[PDB]
Symmetry: D2
């Protein structure tokens, strides 16, 4: 029969509202509740038996680590339930990529977990939210969606929660991945073209049930004439690990290297990422002697993704060699 | 009757060196001299009369504001000479997009200024440097190249120095612009398909000859659970303007808003940019009341690009409304 | 005051209708008339004084050369009128790129000509048509839109009618150009980032007023084991010129070259294009001796674009050297 | 204990030759031998024990169905030998995507089969061939490469032979897949990010050892004002199946429909593909009643790719429903 799908609403633009129908970029996020959001798509009933639950009502750029745990643990409870077949989470696009990757690492279930949002508020003309939610439920109730990890369904695509990222502003095609979408969803039907190769959900060594609180991890941006100011201030404020958002291949300025070395000697993990996020990856020992300095490379993960993985990995290990191995498998 | 082109060497991967021919990503930059580079491309003579000049031998990620002024002034001197028709600058790829944009804003000349680099060291197999240098001189010696602002010539393309960006790591197609290439360079021939719409070089209200010092501008990255720590730290250490690299449409977490407001009252310019750099732009008054807070929006410019424009702009005005106009015109 | 905008409706998906709101890819095109299409966007009134006119009601893949002339001449009449400031044409996406390029070459006016369509029918949920039409009128009533040539406004972008093409199926971001969009349209405001470099509208040597009928031009596809069968059959059926949709750089199979040579000797113009349409261009004399055989290269234009330019150019010249010059300027 | 890799040379640009070092696009293909190619990359020895074999010396645009069978059978023989671990095939870029897909369908083996080419002749500056060949052997000698189907290694990427396509002319980044790269190859090391979802090699129901002849399949291009001329001509000359390269979602002009129906009754398979090859796919029963007319839809495969699948499929069945299943699984 129909699959049982639960919709966990967290707010965002999909639940936002603007001044008029012409307002597709200027609006107030997290204004509409889950039940009114479900009622806007009557054709949802033909896809599955759907239930709405309001986990929170926020603008995603203002999300906290405790908001993540709250959502993560609620997902884990729903997943354990026999009466729940799939899970759809409505999330603001700003940090959707962070939450999607977090869930991918800590939810040890093969049940479909789909995160969805929209680039235009439901009050705008040609609002992308209705179809995105339809596609979300369509994918969550599909048996073929199992064992694929966390999924993001926007712009008629099925993107991997791991490496999808908000790469384009304003437009509905906002979410892209350097390794392409896994498939597409058209008229309730899912079409797969690729499979993930990185560890996730059921085969992850991490488990949200064991996590009580996440370690503080912060990101410093690198550019011309950059100093160590931001790096030291974040570390002094409690950061257990710093994500270096370097130029090119995770490059570090000669006048910032000393700060990073002493920060490492003082127990802070130094993870090299970059602001070159359309493609490619940061190679270990290429731009900097990571072995010599005992640093970690973030591979292909962008700064915000790298932070998420760092937080999670550190609840299990403070070993840099193991942290490096984790950045190469997840 | 061959044009006179001067090559201004600054280091980078083009003048880099790896341990073997199989080393295309692991190597040491700034190892080769200017006339050694010129000697490797004998065919350069066919295109024009080339003169080499070593301005500096550095890795671009370690560039400083003074290095920018030195290069900017050396370029201005060459531009005023009648014995110079076009100017080529070999520069490390890491911060090439920053320098190229700086020159696009402060060089009051219609003579071609082409910045070029390479993703592979000249010691590697299939090194991309030689052809890149050849195309650079080909474009600099071409009369059709005048009046189009600063250009970057890599991957057989003619990119605008304004918005071209290092978006992909490792690959030779590293540089991309959200608005596309202006043209292409094939077998010494230039092909134009697009023209710049933004103010540059000749019609720029800025001039390197009147610029003696650049104000300190820093960048703070925004993400999930971000605090005002780095923002305040950077401001306390001399930052006259802070480039906010926000999530989505330059969004600011509710927790960082009051700090940004206080730093604004204290005279630090708040420029909202984003880490969504593949397309679109940050819209004024959308995600935040820029009018109420007297903040500036970076339009389509990424963080590092917005930093350069801010620096240059602030040498002429500290009026936020004038600053916004400038970000909308350059 | 408000600009006078005329909407010329030709049918297509924007005027289509599906079985239910879930039907975004399966529908019946050309079902809704222009007046009902205008009435679906009440906010259109705030943008300009709009008038609707039904030129035809067809599915664009079934468009004829006489349908093009009909539309082309009707545009020319509206453009000559002082009571018309801008023109918007609703057209099916399938051959939108053909019509947009045709108008770009034959309408000698600086008035804004905007072609628009949608990827989903107005009956679907999250239909992209309403906003596309709004953006179309917004752009057509903008004084800054003048002298830019023919424009296509879809997916919040402003694309050039010359090289925009339907490159992706199903998705709203269907239209792409190898040289990028000219700008974007967000909330009725137009933002420009690039300018066209190719000849168009007011500076075109072609004029629809002089054209009574277009020459027959056809396209043959090239692949592995291709024979001359299609090339000879099309020519024998009246084709004055054949567009060779070759592999790679307009390459021609060794067993197809003879047919092309004799076809040329018999008065048929041979234009080399390719099915490598994401980027780059076909170089003259590279893959085949175009000078020796007196062939023409289509530069960067795809097969269907190349056909449009061929048809138009031939109403003025049957000279191959001049045809080549035209393919290098338009 | 170095793996044994055989390089099967077939010609192309890698073995091409230009007049000078400045000639990167104008040159003559198939000029260099297999052991001359191997001698140019001495470092190849570090990776594995390599044996060279010249199967043919042709320009890929002039490839025939028999050339495919010859290569396909020579590959099968090498695959069954225990003295062969991986197979590298140097092939002209023009029809590389066709051959690579053919081999992906008919080679019943999990041993690595890597097809490689280059955009610049080895005589040119910054020729891309040497590194491309190095990566090819690096990937073929890697145990991780087994069971992933045919791979193409250019531009530092690991592309799937199924959907990789020559999408950009001139540039080294010529090959692109709508579903993204599977991984990357850097400094002799392979990095995987995605796995194939479609049937290939080992789990393919096809086998080159049981294939003696390939049925003739041709392609007709669709556009504005298209007639049934080429469709009928191709069918009258032996075409057992016609690949319709339609506009949009494989749409067919109302004028060409009756002819396609008559050719179907006569036994010619009608496969609807499109010239919208950057993304998306052709949907069954959307633009045309495929069920009523007993036609087949090519899914996401471009024209030349659909031709190869049709050829191979038709050696096993002429049942249209079975043919549709095959297009949905491979
Ligand atoms: C509109 C786009 O989704 C609202 C975005 C907002 N910053 C959010 O909640 O992420
Ligand atoms: C090679 C990439 O171009 C070396 C880059 C280096 N970090 C630089 O000088 O920017
Ligand atoms: C829907 C997409 O626009 C209908 C497309 C149809 N083939 C047309 O009229 O172009
Ligand atoms: C260079 C591009 O690879 C030569 C291509 C030639 N037409 C071929 O052999 O395919």
């Amino acid at each position: 029969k129909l699959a049982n799908v639960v919709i966990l609403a967290t707010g965002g633009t999909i639940a936002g509202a603007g001044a008029s129908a012409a307002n597709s970029a200027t609006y107030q996020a997290a204004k509409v509740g889950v039940d009114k959001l479900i009622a806007g798509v009557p054709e949802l009933a033909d896809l599955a038996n759907v239930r709405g639950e309001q986990v929170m009502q926020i603008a995603s750029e203002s999300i906290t680590n405790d908001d993540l745990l709250k959502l993560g643990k609620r997902v884990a409870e729903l997943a354990d339930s026999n009466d729940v077949d799939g899970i759809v989470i409505t999330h603001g696009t700003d940090t959707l990529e962070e939450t999607a990757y977090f869930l991918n690492l800590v939810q040890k279930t093969d049940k479909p977990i789909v995160v969805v949002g929209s680039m235009r508020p439901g009050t705008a003309m040609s609002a992308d939210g209705m179809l995105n939610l339809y596609n979300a439920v369509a994918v969550a109730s599909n048996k073929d969606s199992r064992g694929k990890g966390v999924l993001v369904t926007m712009n008629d695509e099925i993107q991997s929660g791991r490496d999808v990222s908000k790469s384009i502003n304003i437009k509905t095609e906002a979410f892209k991945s350097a390794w392409g979408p896994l498939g597409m969803v058209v008229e309730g039907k899912s079409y797969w073209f690729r499979l993930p190769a990185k560890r996730h959900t059921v085969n992850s060594e991490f488990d949200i049930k064991q996590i009580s609180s996440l370690p503080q991890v912060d990101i410093a941006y690198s550019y011309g004439n950059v100093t160590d100011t931001a790096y030291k201030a974040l570390a002094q404020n409690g950061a257990k690990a710093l994500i270096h958002a370097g130029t090119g291949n995770g490059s570090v300025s000669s006048r910032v290297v000393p700060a990073l070395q002493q920060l490492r000697k003082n127990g802070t993990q130094i993870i090299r990422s970059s602001h070159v996020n359309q493609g490619g990856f940061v190679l270990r020992n290429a731009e900097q002697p990571d072995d010599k300095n005992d640093w970690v490379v973030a591979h292909d993960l962008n700064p915000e993704k790298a932070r998420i993985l760092a937080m999670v990995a550190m609840t299990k290990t403070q070993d840099s060699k193991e942290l490096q191995r984790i950045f190469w498998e997840y």
